[PDB]
């Protein structure tokens, strides 16, 4: 004696992939005052190694670099389109992969400075509490390890370094890797065959710098550390052009008595997985079915009780943002057209049934003991919308077909 009823606008999301927006102060939409929405009683499984932001930001930086026709990095945001959302894992000890709580929602992201470097992380966002180790396969893999440091270091380039912070940071790093790796930790130069990926590559206002780093990683600082460095000649004793920056993260690689790690290696994208590791792109699915007794910030509700989320929905959502009277650009126009088509498709689904534009309507479709053999109380006052949708997703197509047939046959 339970009847199917249709809700529209419920806070149910799922992992997906889409193209985002530029945001800066090609693609230059102005960014106004932002905001953040906390979430409650929701657990999110994050996996930054399989993220999709990295490829998009790599493509965007390639497009920016090619457009040459001064290039100091500026805080650039990627801002989610209409119909999607950005989820931030704000856990204190979120190593990078796994479940985490205290996940929050943002309309879109914070400032990212596109800076390219290898074997060292420049001007990146600092850690929060402790030294963080990031790796897809820590135990055994020829995959790079990212060490995120809470104590920043200063560098100036001939690079000049203050060896006290380097000694302290190496002590902290080796102690922090001690529990994961039983063998004694020792650091060795890359021992590579060329300087392409075994050196210190970066740029300073149009000048390329290939700076040696073997003195930093060896088997005593003895005061200020001096580093020889070269500039890319275009077809001597130099390297001090007053270029200062901040060292924030290290890239290390393992090797197959004592454990020996080799810095350097990897590609340029892994410099960038270390900045967008907290973030996930998610797609809302504002449609749901539920059994009832009737017969006939848009995401704060998620994580709460079935009924509590059910009663808080309103009509305030006009469609499915901030800037106005500007140039759209190709990417934003594409995203907006896709969003409009998605909304029109959902409206067509509603119109085919008996809701006819209303949010909550009842239909003549009897419930079954095989879609869910759960008590009415269990369904309607103790489980989140997301978990119910995940459990019912197997039979959604059959439910829709039965609903269409019943509406037509009347």
């Amino acid at each position, epitope marked *: 004696n339970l009847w199917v*009823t249709v809700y529209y606008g419920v806070p149910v999301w799922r992992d997906a992939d889409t193209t985002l927006f530029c945001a800066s102060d090609a693609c230059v939409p102005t960014d106004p005052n932002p905001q953040e929405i906390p979430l*409650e*009683n929701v657990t999110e499984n994050f996996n930054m190694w399989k993220n999709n932001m990295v490829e998009q930001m790599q493509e965007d930086v390639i497009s920016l670099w090619d457009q040459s026709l001064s290039f100091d990095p500026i805080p650039i945001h990627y801002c989610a389109p209409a119909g999607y959302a950005i989820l931030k894992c704000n856990d204190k000890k979120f190593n990078g992969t796994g479940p985490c709580k205290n996940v929050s929602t943002v309309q879109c992201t914070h400032g990212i400075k596109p800076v390219v470097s290898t074997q060292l992380l420049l001007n990146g966002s600092l850690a929060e509490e402790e030294i963080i180790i990031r790796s897809e396969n820590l135990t055994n893999n020829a995959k790079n390890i990212i060490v995120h440091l809470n104590k920043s270091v200063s560098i100036s380039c001939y690079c000049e370094l203050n060896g006290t912070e380097w000694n302290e940071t190496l002590n902290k790093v080796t102690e922090k890797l001690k529990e994961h790796f039983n063998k004694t930790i020792v650091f060795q130069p890359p021992s590579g065959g060329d300087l392409e990926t075994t050196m210190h590559h970066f740029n300073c206002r149009g000048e390329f710098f290939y700076c040696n780093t073997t003195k930093l990683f060896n088997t005593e600082f003895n005061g200020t550390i001096i580093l020889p460095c070269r500039i890319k000649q275009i077809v001597p004793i130099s390297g001090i052009i007053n270029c200062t920056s901040n060292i924030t993260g290290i890239i290390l690689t393992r090797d197959g008595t004592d454990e020996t790690f080799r810095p350097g290696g990897g590609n340029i994208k892994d410099n960038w997985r270390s900045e967008l590791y907290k973030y996930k792109v998610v797609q809302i699915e504002p449609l749901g079915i539920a059994p*009832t*007794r*009737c*017969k006939r910030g848009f995401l*704060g*509700a998620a994580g*709460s*009780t*079935m*009924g*509590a*989320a*059910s*009663i*808080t929905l309103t009509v305030q959502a006009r469609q499915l943002w901030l800037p106005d009277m500007t140039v759209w650009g190709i990417k934003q126009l594409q995203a907006r057209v896709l969003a409009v088509e998605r909304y029109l498709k959902d409206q067509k689904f509603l119109g085919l049934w008996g809701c006819s534009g209303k949010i*909550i309507c*009842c239909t003549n479709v009897p419930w079954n003991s095989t879609w869910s053999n759960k*008590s*009415y*109380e*269990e369904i*309607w*006052n*103790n489980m989140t919308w997301i978990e119910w949708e995940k459990e019912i997703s197997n039979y959604t197509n059959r439910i829709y077909d039965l609903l269409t047939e019943s509406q037509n046959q009347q």
Partner: antibody, heavy 124, light 112 residues
Framework: QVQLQQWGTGLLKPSETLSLTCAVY????????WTWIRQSPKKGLEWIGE???????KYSQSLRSRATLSIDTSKKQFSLRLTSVTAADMATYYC??????????????????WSQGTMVTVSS | DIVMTQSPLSLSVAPGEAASISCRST???????????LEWYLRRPGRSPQLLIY???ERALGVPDRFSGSGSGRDFTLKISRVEAQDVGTYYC?????????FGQGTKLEIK
């Protein structure tokens, strides 16, 4: 696991305002009806009023004249004041929380979580 | 504004068998679609009363399935399969149909 705590006076002389506050820990206020219940030793339980989370209120016609209800969403609290309490009117013992669901109507399931409650006394 | 009635006023139930509580109103409580706008609560001595039955007859979490409800319109009944140690106390009806609500005089249940 949601819990309710209650602060107030309890001991007051007759014929002034009884103000009592109640806080919730464990869930937000967005999707429920927060209500209270008089508990008289001779009248049992009796419904006094309820408030949503945007401030809309519902009272009882017998106690509408001299009772007021209010919400503070900053710290998830809510309180009441009764003007000119009487010895025979010994009210506002427990806090409460009702459950809700919406299909063409705001239907009302049962109320689940209960505060520890407080004892109110009136002097001579 | 419904005068609400419970029966019997006091109960004396021995362990091992069912116990029945009857509960009546003045104006009909049946909903055109909803099953019933009536609820059943239990209060133990010195404890905050909890939920037993909501919106008709379906129980909620924490029930030992030992309590069940039935009835419609005028007569409502609640039956208990077994009474040993924790369901002794006082049972209350609740009319939630319109306007001012009324619990009504409770029913005391104990053991001989």
């Amino acid at each position: 696991q949601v819990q309710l705590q209650q602060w107030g006076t309890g001991l007051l002389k007759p014929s002034e305002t009884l103000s009592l506050t109640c806080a919730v820990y464990g869930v937000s206020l967005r999707g429920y009806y927060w209500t209270w219940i008089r508990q008289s030793p001779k009248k049992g339980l009796e419904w006094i009023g309820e408030i949503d989370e945007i401030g809309r209120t519902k009272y009882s016609q017998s106690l509408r004249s001299r009772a007021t209800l209010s919400i503070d969403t900053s710290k998830k609290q809510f309180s009441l004041r009764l003007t000119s309490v009487t010895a025979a009117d010994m009210a506002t013992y427990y806090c409460a929380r009702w459950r809700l669901m919406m299909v063409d109507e705001v239907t009302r399931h049962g109320m689940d979580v209960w505060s520890q409650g407080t004892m109110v006394t009136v002097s001579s | 504004d419904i005068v609400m009635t419970q029966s019997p006023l006091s109960l004396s139930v021995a362990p091992g068998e069912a116990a029945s509580i009857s509960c009546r109103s003045t104006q009909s409580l049946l909903n055109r679609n909803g099953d019933n706008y009536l609820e059943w609560y239990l209060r133990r001595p010195g404890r905050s009363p909890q939920l037993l039955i909501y919106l008709g007859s379906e129980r909620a979490l924490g029930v030992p399935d030992r309590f069940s409800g039935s009835g419609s319109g005028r007569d409502f009944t609640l039956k208990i399969s077994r009474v040993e140690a924790q369901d002794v106390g006082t049972y209350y009806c609740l009319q939630t149909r319109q306007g001012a609500f009324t619990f009504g005089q409770g029913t005391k249940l104990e053991i001989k």
